[PDB]
Amino acid sequence: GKCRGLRTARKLRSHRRDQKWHDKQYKKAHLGTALKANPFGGASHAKGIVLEKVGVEAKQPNSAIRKCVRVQLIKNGKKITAFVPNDGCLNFIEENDEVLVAGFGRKGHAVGDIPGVRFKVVKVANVSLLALYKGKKERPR
Amino acid sequence: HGSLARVGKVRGQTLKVAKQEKKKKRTGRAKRRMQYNRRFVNVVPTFGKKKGPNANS
Amino acid sequence: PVARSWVCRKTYVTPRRPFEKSRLDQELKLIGEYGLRNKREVWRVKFTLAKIRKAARELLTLDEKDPRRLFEGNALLRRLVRIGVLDEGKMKLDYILGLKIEDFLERRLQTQVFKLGLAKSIHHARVLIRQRHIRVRKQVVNIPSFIVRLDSQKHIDFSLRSPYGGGRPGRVKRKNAKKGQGGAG
Amino acid sequence: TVTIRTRKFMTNRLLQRKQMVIDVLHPGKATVPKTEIREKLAKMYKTTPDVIFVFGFRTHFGGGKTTGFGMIYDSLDYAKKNEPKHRLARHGLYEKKKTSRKQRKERKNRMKKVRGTAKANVGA
RNA sequence: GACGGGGAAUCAGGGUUCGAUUCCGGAGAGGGAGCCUGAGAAACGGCUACCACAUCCAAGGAAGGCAGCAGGCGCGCAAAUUACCCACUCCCGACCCGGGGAGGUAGUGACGAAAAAUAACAAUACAGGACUCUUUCGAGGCCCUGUAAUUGGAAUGAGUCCACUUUAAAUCCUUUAACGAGGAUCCAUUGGAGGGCAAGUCUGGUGCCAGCAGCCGCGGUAAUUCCAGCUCCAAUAGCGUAUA
């Protein structure tokens, strides 16, 4: 520290508060902007309705297409873009089918070579995608 | 071909073979007993770098 | 408002490094040597010895000729002598820090049955403890994690209701005798 | 071949009863019923086996020990006065009304429904 | 996105975050307002005025407030039986004697915490290991150490099933009859095998396609990273993912 007086606690406190406000994580966690602009709104999982299935491309050093869906939310109705994880699971998703989206790994940040997608799907038609992969459960009919 | 970016293409075209029928593996305490056995008390003093259990070169 | 307890705590601690060679080999060696089930038991014994060592260091931090230091040091020393992992010659507080985890694993009931001579192997000792064949002072024990005392080591013996210690024969022996009497008459 | 020992035996002149913690030894056998326990407590106390009340027998692990409580009275009516009614029903000397709480509460609300001598009439 | 506090998590020492939540105190019964009785209420399982909402109706009127116990709708990632009893603990009344969704009991219950089965013994199978030796060949292998769908005997547990015990009556635990296991089919899963970070340059298929990958990166017609089998590594009735 710099201020080393015996009767100095206030300058230390106010300077520590100001330099704590001059941060990124403490600025993010204590303002209403970073939660008001958050699509999940401080929630881990969310439900939604798929409207379109759009394949977005990869980044520079690798070449692929990435299978994604356009999901509108139920609680606030905004439009996000999810990402179906596994191989060949887009055939289980039909128009206007309810899904369960979740986080993608880096706390509201784009992960890997997929540009601009921060969410991924876990369950579709109120059954898990893993059980549809492993041949354990069947979609209701 | 059909098309380029088909979903489930490789796994759909992958040859389908099943499991091989085998006995059950020892689970619980005897799994650790066999692990300690094979790892420690059935060794010989070799030289050089040790070989991994999955070395099949 | 309901009348319950709501008091509980963990007895084991997970180490910070999940995958490195030496501590994994040391724990696996201890599991194989004393015939335990999993790593949670040796982690539990390490947790108990860590709490005892922390209490001993807290007592050794406080200066000599104090009432609470002498009281808690004599209480912990008497308990640690009576549990069987210390000696009356080593009746000092600064020797608590020199203990190792194998000394705490010595007074387990499974290895005590194995070292007394009531079972062939230590795994045979564990499947003898889990089987309810022995007793400690006219009362059977089923749990292999039964820590014993210095005055309780001599009194361990087979139970009354056991074919090994004299009693009713078991199910398979009675089934074979019934098969023999059926084949004979 | 079962034996009974006594522990914490004390008398109450102000409750006209004797209280003790009994110890039951039944090795190689299941838990003995309360009637034989009552008859043995009647034997060693020189008492008729009607004022003998035992309760709460918990069995230890391993077999051989069971800790219970015993209650010793002097006469029948003095036993009948200061007794819980469920032990009298277990002995067979008391009978409680057999109806459930829901229809009692609904019938109480039906007495609340009207006023007068017909309050007894509406509850049948 | 504040009920406060006693507290909780994490913790060398200093600290950071949470505290709706059973104990204490405060506030309210849709929201403001007014009042009777009573010692003590601005009481709402008391009354009265408003609006929002809402039940029945011969259309004149009448009757309400589950943020109590169960339960329903809505909401959302998210949360249980329209069960039994005052026997245990207390409270109230004229009162030993009546009442108590306060409470206790059971069911649902992988929030979480503690304990703990899924094997062991004996001999043959076939390789080594310590002792004078046979330079190295057989051997005591009596003293071991191990695993290969080799065999045979000792054992009890889940579950079925009398009784007893417990309890207001049960149920659960324990005691306990008669039953109840050789591949003991009574069959242990979850995430991985390039580095971080324990563990294949094994085999077959696609060929910057499918896809994997928290990061670096991997796929271009020989993939140590994809899709499948075998082997194995980590925790173990538990493991993985997303969030503060």
What would the DSSP string read from start to end of C4-42?
------------S-SS-HHHHHHHHHHHHHHT-S-HHHH
Identify the three-state secondary structure at position B10: helix
d(CA A52, CA A95): 7
Let me know: does D26 contact D62? Beta carbons within 8 Å: no
Sequence length of chain C is 185
- The set of residues, in sequence order, having a beta carbon less than 8 Å from that of B23 and lying 6+ positions away, is none
Cα C174–chain centre separation: 34
**Tokens read off for A137:** 């459960």
d(CA C37, CA C5): 30
Q: Burial of B38 by CB count in 10 Å (0-12 exposed, 13-18 middle, 19+ buried)? A: exposed
Yes or no: domain D3-123 corresponds to CATH 2.40.50.100: no
Asked if strand E comes closer than 7 Å to D110 Cβ, the answer is no
End-to-end CA distance of chain A: 69
d(CA C45, CA C37): 13
d(CA D48, CA D38): 10
Q: Residue D49 corresponds to which amino acid?
A: P
Identify the three-state secondary structure at position D79: helix
d(CA C148, CA C85): 10
- Per-residue CA distances from C65 to A44, C56, C74 (Å): 57, 16, 13
Let me know: does C82 contact C106? Beta carbons within 8 Å: no
Let me know: does A103 contact A109? Beta carbons within 8 Å: no
| Residue among C139, C141, C157 with most chain D CBs within 10 A, to mutate | C139
d(CA C33, CA C28): 8
Q: Residue C181 corresponds to which amino acid?
A: Q
d(CA C96, CA C50): 11
Report, in ranges, which bases of strand E sit under 7 Å from a protein C-beta: 1, 22-23, 75-77, 84-88, 100-105, 112-122, 128, 145-147, 149, 153-156, 163-169, 173-177, 179-180, 183-185, 187-188, 191, 193, 197-202, 204-206, 208-220, 226-237, 241-244
Consecutive H or E run containing D6: strand D3-12
Cα C119–chain centre separation: 17
- Per-residue CA distances from C150 to C20, C44, C109, C140 (Å): 38, 22, 12, 18
Identify the three-state secondary structure at position C83: coil
Residue with CA nearest to E89's C1' atom? C3
Q: After which residues is the backbone of chain A broken at C–N > 2.5 Å?
A: none
Q: Give the experimental resolution in Å.
A: 3.6
State residue A70 phi and psi, 5-degree precision: -100, 120
Q: Inter-axis angle of helices C21-34 and B29-36, to 10 degrees? A: 120
Residue in C118, C101, C100 with CA at minimum distance from that of residue C109 = C118
d(CA B45, CA A47): 60
Its sign, for the CA torsion C51, C53, C59, C61, is negative
Cα C146–chain centre separation: 4
Cα C32–chain centre separation: 16
**Tokens read off for D37:** 């326990």
The coordinates were experimentally obtained by cryo-EM
- The set of residues, in sequence order, having a beta carbon less than 8 Å from that of C98 and lying 6+ positions away, is none
Q: Compare all CA atoms of chain B with the CA of A66 and give the residue at the minimum distance.
A: B5
Q: What does DSSP assign to residue D72?
A: E
Identify the three-state secondary structure at position D62: coil
d(CA A101, CA A83): 9
- Taking 3-state DSSP, the helix, strand and coil percentages for chain C, each rounded to the nearest 5, stand at 50, 5, 45
Structure-token match 């199910």, residue found: C171
Q: Where are the domains of chain D?
A: 3-123
Consecutive H or E run containing D54: strand D52-59
d(CA D72, CA D17): 6
- The set of residues, in sequence order, having a beta carbon less than 8 Å from that of C179 and lying 6+ positions away, is none
Structure-token match 């071949």, residue found: D1
d(CA C170, CA C163): 7
Residue in C129, C123, C112 with CA at minimum distance from that of residue C33 = C123
- The set of residues, in sequence order, having a beta carbon less than 8 Å from that of C123 and lying 6+ positions away, is B29, B30, B33, C35
Question: DSSP letters along chain A, please?
Answer: -----TT-SHHHHHHHHHHHHSSSHHHHHTSSHHHHS-SSSS-S-EEEEEEEEEEEE--SSS--EEEEEEEEESSS--EEE----STT-GGG--TT-EEEEEE-SSSSS--TT-TT--EEEEEETTEEHHHHHHT------
For residue A48, the enclosing domain spans: 1-141
Mark whether A and C touch (3+ CB pairs within 8 Å): no
CA distance C38 to chain B (A): 7
Let me know: does C94 contact C60? Beta carbons within 8 Å: yes
Beta pairing class for A65-73 and A119-124: unpaired
Cα C170–chain centre separation: 28
d(CA C171, CA A137): 44
Residue in A55, A58, A53, A54 with CA at minimum distance from that of residue A114 = A58
